[PDB]
Amino acid sequence: MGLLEQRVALVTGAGGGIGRGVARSFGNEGAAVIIAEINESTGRQVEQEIREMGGRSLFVKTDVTSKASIEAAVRSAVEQFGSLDILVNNAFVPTPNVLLEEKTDEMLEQTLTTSLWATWWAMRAAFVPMRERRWGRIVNFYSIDTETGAWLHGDYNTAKAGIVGLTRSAASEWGRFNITVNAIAPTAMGATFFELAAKNPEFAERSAAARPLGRSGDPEQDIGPAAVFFASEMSRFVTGETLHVDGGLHLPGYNSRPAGIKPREY
Amino acid sequence: MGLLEQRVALVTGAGGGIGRGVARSFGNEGAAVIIAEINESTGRQVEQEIREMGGRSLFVKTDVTSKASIEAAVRSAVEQFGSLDILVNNAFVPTPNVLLEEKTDEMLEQTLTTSLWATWWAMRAAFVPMRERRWGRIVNFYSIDTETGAWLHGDYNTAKAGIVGLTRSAASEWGRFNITVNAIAPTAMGATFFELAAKNPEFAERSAAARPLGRSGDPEQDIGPAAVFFASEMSRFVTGETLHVDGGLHLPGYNSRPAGIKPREY
Amino acid sequence: MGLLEQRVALVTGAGGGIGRGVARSFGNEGAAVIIAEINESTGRQVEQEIREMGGRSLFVKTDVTSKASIEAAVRSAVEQFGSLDILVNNAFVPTPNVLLEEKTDEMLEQTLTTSLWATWWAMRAAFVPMRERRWGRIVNFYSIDTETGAWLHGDYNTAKAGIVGLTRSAASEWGRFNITVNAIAPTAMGATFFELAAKNPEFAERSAAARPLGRSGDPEQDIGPAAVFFASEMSRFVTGETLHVDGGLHLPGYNSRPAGIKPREY
Amino acid sequence: MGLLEQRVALVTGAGGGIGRGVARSFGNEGAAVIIAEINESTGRQVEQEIREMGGRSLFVKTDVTSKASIEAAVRSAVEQFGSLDILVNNAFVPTPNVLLEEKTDEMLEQTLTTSLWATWWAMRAAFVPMRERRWGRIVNFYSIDTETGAWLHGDYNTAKAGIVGLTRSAASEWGRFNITVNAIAPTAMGATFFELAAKNPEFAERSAAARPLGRSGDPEQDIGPAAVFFASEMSRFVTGETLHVDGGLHLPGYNSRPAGIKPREY
Numbered sequence A, B, C, D: 001m002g003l004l005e006q007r008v009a010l011v012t013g014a015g016g017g018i019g020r021g022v023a024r025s026f027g028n029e030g031a032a033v034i035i036a037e038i039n040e041s042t043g044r045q046v047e048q049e050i051r052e053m054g055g056r057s058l059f060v061k062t063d064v065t066s067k068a069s070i071e072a073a074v075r076s077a078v079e080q081f082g083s084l085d086i087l088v089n090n091a092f093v094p095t096p097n098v099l100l101e102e103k104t105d106e107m108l109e110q111t112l113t114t115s116l117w118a119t120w121w122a123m124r125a126a127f128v129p130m131r132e133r134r135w136g137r138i139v140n141f142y143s144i145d146t147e148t149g150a151w152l153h154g155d156y157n158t159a160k161a162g163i164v165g166l167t168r169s170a171a172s173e174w175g176r177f178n179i180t181v182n183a184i185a186p187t188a189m190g191a192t193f194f195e196l197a198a199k200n201p202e203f204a205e206r207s208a209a210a211r212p213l214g215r216s217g218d219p220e221q222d223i224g225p226a227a228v229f230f231a232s233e234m235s236r237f238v239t240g241e242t243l244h245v246d247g248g249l250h251l252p253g254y255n256s257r258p259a260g261i262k263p264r265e266y
């Protein structure tokens, strides 16, 4: 049997990258998948892809910077498929890669909204049907950058670290309802990867060689199954955890100092 | 020879609790201490305490929810004493201790403002004189609650987790200017401690027994010297770290489930 | 399809407890399971249980305190079933629960042998067939006690912490052969649990209530699937990780100070 | 007033490298320093340097692979200076830098003896006078390699990870006597550094540039003061902690794959 049969999942930002890989992976395991995506073109594409592969899916245009929009997508999951068993908080909006003192307050506010507030709003909305059914899986996304303090990502590192604190808090409190809450730090060939690869011909080589498994991540084949684990009965005794799904990159780390910045100015 | 001679420090929320203990410890090590405190009465009391003990201090009324007020306090430090070598981000405002699904968006916004934004604004303001002088020490405060996901503190846990991500980011980037950035997770007999002790006669004894060193922390004698370490040349090769200053409490943890909550409702 | 079809697993100490639960889980996912167990009676029992459920299994008497016995068990897996794709280092022997200064050198030697050396020897023996096929999954077991410094377990805590260092080293180096290496910190109802439950009639209910999910772990249903994840293609991009499979216990921790010990003696 | 006045410290392997830097730092803070070192020439050199600088010192020929030799040095500290308040377990013996599958059992046994057993024996011997006086500081040394799984160091990574488990165990239990136990992960220009620098002309510059503070560590000026912190009243409320003293290297990590090893062979 598929690992997610008779379950309903909502994946934010599922039109592309890791969210698309997770949504397709979920569809192949029997889940009804809500594609909660702001891009109507790519959201409907993934909806149709899951259906063509024999799965159940529904695109709901969703802007995770709006609490009302998130609540409406959660209501659609429950109304159209009968439950919302699985929540994946994946959507991401980049800010310019600039040094910390060059980041603006507007960048930090935008990143807090699209990462942290989006996760807060979706978790609290999904909590209601999960609590009623005494079964839930919440899969949040953070980043290895929160642990390395990666250069140029100061606002992102701050918001995604906040997501870890929220993950642990909900895991602690909501386990009494058989709702588990965990966070994945993935790396994969998503939109950022292809942007970096287009600008630097040696980027992909160095990125693959940077990690113990010596290769870059595929969203569906490499990240998908880890989300399935955390969305299924297989992780029924796991809550409050962080897991790196990154080819082992978390072991060596990576030095992200930009080329034009001297290591020592004192 | 005091460990902070000829250095200037700004401590937010230094009118009481841990901030007061840190400020007094800094004064005894020869630093000029700006008491960046919103409560005029307690802020002036600590300024005078440091002076009466032979140190240098200046109370500067500061509201860390206002970027302009923080920036004005940083200018006051440089104008009055010639530099701002050391920044301690300590100020705290509580929200109601309620279950995560009962926290309001307003509570999370307030906690993000008083903890995370306050730290962000003060770090970037203090960065300007620190960069120019190629010497800086930033000491942020987070909490063991971010690691246990402590019940009833979901907003606090989220914001203080963000502080850790911000600490690592600035440590990574600003080391090129000999600015170090570290975070302390303290426990001590502050305002929260005495409130809890007043409602529960056995609280203080159980709190001391909960940890390996078997006693409760004194702000000035137990937290103060850890702050002095991270504000001095002793920590000149330490950056991006988290240190628990808690009698060892981080080892056993603590179970924070409220008495009236059934551990299993499924 | 079963998640481990056409794969061969060797589980040390699989005659009882978590090892038995993992071996039965593996058999139900299509793996041929070598029961590498020192107790012939329980080892054969588990072999026969897996066969009666429609799986493939072979009991091989193995003493993990002997390098030659481990090497022979690895040869038995390859000779009988054609490969050795999955290694689970689970076997355990207790030492007396005594204060750290009362542990003997002999106790530390014994625990280093049964935990650390057993894992070292088995990993290096299994490496040969895994490298040959460029596919391997190694699952090591450590303990939350290594992170809390649990009282009375000082030798165990030391050896199991060593396991984490060895896990990360092999993950770092052997990823180039598509061998992944991860460690689980489980809690479940094994031999120790039932010993404690027999000596204390309220132990089970207190142990279940100590964690966010509010229930004790079943070896097969709660730990089994986490081992399956780390033994399968689902974890193909995960290596060098530690995962707590414990109902969330790692969040609150637990205070293990014995009842008769005064918390403060100074 | 020195931070270690009227205290007595025993530093293993204090004839050179970090041990020598810590011993000299301790002497300048007023401690009587026992140089527990196997090299008579360098041990006596460091003894004379501390005495020439106005400090108190005694070289005791000590081989940390021998429990009796460790016990004799502890007895000499108590007899000759009246106490043994501070223990620093620093000694190190290298094994060949070879791939994990090429390490021998003899190498793991040797590293377990010189790192782990030496620490176990010295901790339990120093415990006796520390407990009697209800005051103790134990400073153990582990390594960032335990966290990155650094290539070619598999035996060292395993033993030093064990040190962390032992550190947490003793912190948990021995705090009741006001004995704290902490572990530092340092990097500095010790014997290994100068060997690497001599074999590669660009090693030192690249090693300095690999970390946020952009410079390599000096044993006395950079590591010494962190050991003083953990050996003094300043850390009286800190126990069971790990602290990186490495210029921030723990943030980016480092990729230790050897030049001639393929990142991917599958």
Ligand SMILES: NC(=O)c1ccc[n+]([C@@H]2O[C@H](COP(=O)([O-])OP(=O)(O)OC[C@H]3O[C@@H](n4cnc5c(N)ncnc54)[C@H](O)[C@@H]3O)[C@@H](O)[C@H]2O)c1
Residues within 6 Å of the ligand: A012, A013, A014, A015, A016, A017, A018, A019, A036, A037, A038, A039, A042, A062, A063, A064, A065, A089, A090, A091, A092, A093, A114, A141, A142, A143, A144, A185, A186, A187, A188, A189, A190, A191, A192, A193
């Ligand atoms: N790709 C990596 O290597 C990597 C590394 C670390 C962390 N992550 C994290 O994994 C998750 C996915 O990363 P990715 O690389 O696949 O991203 P991506 O850029 O490839 O896709 C992001 C998706 O989110 C959609 N989206 C943007 N704004 C939205 C909004 N308001 N509302 C709803 N949807 C919106 C986008 O249209 C897009 O489909 C993110 O949380 C990311 O931070 C990824």
Ligand SMILES: NC(=O)c1ccc[n+]([C@@H]2O[C@H](COP(=O)([O-])OP(=O)(O)OC[C@H]3O[C@@H](n4cnc5c(N)ncnc54)[C@H](O)[C@@H]3O)[C@@H](O)[C@H]2O)c1
Residues within 6 Å of the ligand: B012, B013, B014, B015, B016, B017, B018, B019, B036, B037, B038, B039, B042, B062, B063, B064, B065, B089, B090, B091, B092, B093, B114, B141, B142, B143, B144, B185, B186, B187, B188, B189, B190, B191, B192
């Ligand atoms: N005391 C503990 O056990 C403990 C535990 C974990 C974390 N912490 C953290 O340590 C730090 C201090 O804790 P505490 O218990 O001593 O707090 P406290 O409540 O005793 O003191 C807080 C100080 O902050 C001042 N303040 C409040 N709002 C302010 C504002 N806008 N602007 C300027 N000043 C303001 C207050 O007037 C007060 O003087 C906090 O960051 C706290 O989160 C403390």
Ligand SMILES: NC(=O)c1ccc[n+]([C@@H]2O[C@H](COP(=O)([O-])OP(=O)(O)OC[C@H]3O[C@@H](n4cnc5c(N)ncnc54)[C@H](O)[C@@H]3O)[C@@H](O)[C@H]2O)c1
Residues within 6 Å of the ligand: C012, C013, C014, C015, C016, C017, C018, C019, C036, C037, C038, C039, C042, C062, C063, C064, C065, C089, C090, C091, C092, C093, C114, C141, C142, C143, C144, C185, C186, C187, C188, C189, C190, C191, C192, C193
């Ligand atoms: N059960 C828990 O809560 C828990 C908690 C933390 C860690 N662990 C770890 O999980 C693993 C299993 O724990 P468990 O509680 O199921 O143990 P258990 O005591 O129930 O089973 C141990 C098995 O190991 C076998 N064995 C003993 N010595 C052996 C030897 N030389 N050679 C081969 N087999 C031998 C035993 O005969 C037995 O079948 C262990 O590594 C343990 O340290 C368990």
Ligand SMILES: NC(=O)c1ccc[n+]([C@@H]2O[C@H](COP(=O)([O-])OP(=O)(O)OC[C@H]3O[C@@H](n4cnc5c(N)ncnc54)[C@H](O)[C@@H]3O)[C@@H](O)[C@H]2O)c1
Residues within 6 Å of the ligand: D012, D013, D014, D015, D016, D017, D018, D019, D036, D037, D038, D039, D042, D062, D063, D064, D065, D089, D090, D091, D092, D093, D114, D141, D142, D143, D144, D185, D186, D187, D188, D189, D190, D191, D192, D193
């Ligand atoms: N230097 C670094 O960058 C670094 C990095 C990570 C960890 N460490 C750790 O810090 C500590 C010191 O490192 P280092 O580079 O200064 O080492 P080092 O090689 O420079 O000095 C080692 C000292 O130990 C002495 N010694 C060797 N065997 C001994 C024995 N049986 N008994 C007593 N003394 C003995 C040596 O004679 C020497 O004086 C070690 O524990 C090391 O693992 C250092």
Ligand SMILES: [Cl-]
Residues within 6 Å of the ligand: A187, A188, A189, A215, A216, A217, A246
């Ligand atoms: Cl990748």
Ligand SMILES: [Cl-]
Residues within 6 Å of the ligand: B187, B188, B189, B215, B216, B217, B246
């Ligand atoms: Cl306290």
Ligand SMILES: [Cl-]
Residues within 6 Å of the ligand: C187, C188, C189, C215, C216, C217, C246
């Ligand atoms: Cl359990």
Ligand SMILES: [Cl-]
Residues within 6 Å of the ligand: D187, D188, D189, D215, D216, D217, D246
């Ligand atoms: Cl260095």
